[PDB]
Amino acid sequence: MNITQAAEQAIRLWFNTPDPMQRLHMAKTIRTWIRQDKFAQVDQANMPNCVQQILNIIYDGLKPQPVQLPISYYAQLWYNLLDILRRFTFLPIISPYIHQVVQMFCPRENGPQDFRELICNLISLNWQKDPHMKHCANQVFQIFNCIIMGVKNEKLRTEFAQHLKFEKLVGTLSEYFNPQVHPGMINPAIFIIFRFIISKDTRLKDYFIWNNNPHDQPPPPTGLIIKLNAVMIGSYRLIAGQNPETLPQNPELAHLIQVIIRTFDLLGLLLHDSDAIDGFVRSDGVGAITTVVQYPNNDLIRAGCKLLLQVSDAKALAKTPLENILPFLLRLIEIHPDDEVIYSGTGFLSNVVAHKQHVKDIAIRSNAIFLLHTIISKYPRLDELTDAPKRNRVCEIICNCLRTLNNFLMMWIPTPNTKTAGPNEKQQVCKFIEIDILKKLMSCLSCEGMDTPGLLELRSTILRSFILLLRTPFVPKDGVLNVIDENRKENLIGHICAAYSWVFRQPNNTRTQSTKQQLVERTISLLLVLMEQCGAEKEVAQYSYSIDCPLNLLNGNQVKPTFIHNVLVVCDKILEHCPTRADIWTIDRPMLEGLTNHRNSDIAKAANSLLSRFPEN
Structure with missing residues (x-):
């Protein structure tokens, strides 16, 4: 018998040959046939049947044989069969028949006899402790990874996802996230699978998080919020000492770093609403991330901060100890050279201080006001920025900063229903009326700045900043209207006017209408404030020729x-x-x-x- 004939007989004999050792010999042969031939000899119209025969042998081979057999034997049989399966999921020639692979996962008996539950059992954690069977596990993970990363037909993806959603599989996957498991044991494909099965399935998300518990209790230790945070921390404990310089020749370090990133990413996807986000915060997620992003790896810091931004509006953040976290994040923002981090941090800051007096107090005590001035001061004018992504980010960084400042200014402004500012707080705030930053903010109001999606919100926010600074008792008002930019040769009024006129040239759109209106309202409001507060009724009126009635x-x-x-x-x-x-x-x-x-x-x-x-x- 030659290769092809050896396969032909193997396929033919398989279902009448109950002999274990013959089956293994048989399996090895069908594999090597595929390995070499790459199917090119079989008639095109017979392919569906030829594939289906193989798949049925694979499925039959994975079944427990009636006789008592050594683990060592199954491991060898299964390795060959799972290798064929794996190849059936990346081999260009087989891809028209891929739906036949997916179909195999579809249940029939709803028990430990179905294909999927045999596949599922192979990636059980205890198999990673086995010297022979751990290789079958790693192959199953490649198979999931091949299907998931591979199939483009959206209807087929949907069906595969449906087939995966059963108790034993979700149980099996979660077991990798148990506290007693070393994070070196976490196959990266587990993330890929979790992302796949929760994608656009809210109920599964809430099942992983809450485990049918009430959303106002602590998230349960059996759920993913507690599990994933202990995985972040567990991995961090192991890498914390490690010199990041060793990275390129340190695969264990590289692995754990990627575990942390993938865990940030999964938490991002799981925490889909307010209750989920709050749960995370009450389970000390923010402290967990903040601890973890101490490690000097930029990919890790970016991913950590992205998740902080996402959770920053939690009302539970009114209850978290922030006396240590906030100063660290402020420090991180001050020194980190990456604009995505700056963006994420400052974004976190403005949400965290919002509506929270004691939190405002921590920020201010750690010199947050001085820092906002610095971040705004460090960037060029928007019109000096050529690439779009970069300009829009800078625009969002300034917006975040000014939104943070406005939250502070609000406290020292006299209401009918007066807080006092200290010596240091006063002079930090007064940095914002220095001529250079007024010039920067003025430019933002009036630059022929192009397609910048966050420009509308920036401009509305700057007006608010001017409104609050000028309504603030200790802020000097003498010099504001004497500042004349080098470019347009205009004072604050002209830039305010140019922004107002700009808002009306903009496209009509229900998404933006709300902010356009608030920009118009703040324009009017700022024109009055300037009139009253700067003793400039005349000059405001005459420098306002540019706006219509x-x-x-x-x-x-x-x-x-x-x-x-x-x-x-x-x-x-x-x-x-x-x-x-x-x-x-x-x-x-x-x-x-x-x-x-x-x-x-x-x-x-x-x-x-x-x-x-x-x-x-």
Whole structure:
């Protein structure tokens, strides 16, 4: 018998030859046949049947034989058969028939006899302790990895995913994340599988996390939140001493680093909503990451910070000890050369300080205000940035910083319902009215900055920053309007005006409408603040020739009472110093005469102050 004939007979005899040692001999032969031939001799139209025969031998070979046999034998039989299977999942010639491989996983008996439960049992952890069987495990992992990374037909992917969703498999996978397992034992393909089965399956996600427990209790020790955090920490304990210089010749170190990254990634995908995110935070996830990103590997730090950003809005972060974490993150932001980290950190910072007084207090005590100035100061103007990704990131970094600052400024501003700022806090805040940063922020308002998706939110946020700085008692107001940029030769008013005019040239879009409106409202609000706070009623009015009549802002369904009042007052103040605009503007006189009889006494009063300014005709 020659190769092909040796295979032919092997296939033919298989299902009538119950002899163990003949089956192994037989299996070795079919394998070597594939190994060499790469199927090219079999007739194309017989291929479905030829593949199906092999697959049925594979499936039959993996079944437990009635006689008592040594583990050593199965390991050898299975290695050959699983190797054929593996090859059936990457071999160009077989790919039209790949759905036949997937079909095999589809259950029939719902018991330990199905193909999938035989495959599943081979990657049980205890097999990694076995000197022979651990190689079959590593092959099954390559098989999953081949199917998952390989098949492009979306309907087939979906079916494969469905076939995998059974108790014994999810149990088997989780067992790798138990606290007593050394993380050296975690095959990387386990991540690949988890990503695959949870992809767009919310209920499975909540099952892994919660284990049918209530979402307000501690996440259970049997669930993944506790398991994955102990894996991060376990791996970190092992790499912590290790010199990162050894990396290129240190596969164990490389492995554990990638375990950490893949664990960050999995946690990212699992924590899909508020309750999941909160659970993570109450299980000390933030401390866990923060501890782990101490290790000087940049891929690791990026992935850690990405996950911190994702969890930064947790209300449970009001309860976590942040006295050590926050200073470390501030320090990391100060020194790390990567813009993705800067972005992630500052993003984390603004969310974490939001609505949390004691958290604001930690940030400020660790010089967060000085740091925000530094991060903003270090970047060039947006118009100096050529590549889009980079400019938009810088734009988001500045936005984050200014959002952080605004959260602080809010505390020292007198409300009807007064906190005092210390000597150091005052002078750090006052760095923001230095001429260079005013110039930078002014440029951001008015640069012919191109397609930058986060520009709208930056511009709205800068206006807010100016509003709060100028409403802040200890901030000097004398010099702000004397700052004239080198490029447009304009002061703050002109840049404010250029942004306002810009918002109206922008495309209409329900996604952005909310922010455009808040930018318009803040423009009006900042024009008033400048008028009152800088003693600049005249100059604000005359430097505002570039904007059309603000009254026309009320030509819609605008109900916000504070906005209406601001529009009316700013208009009246403008006509006090530039009377002729009253004849140049084109207003809805009925509407204005309407507002004279408004429920609000302030609106009604200002409306007929303004009406008196207009030509009777």
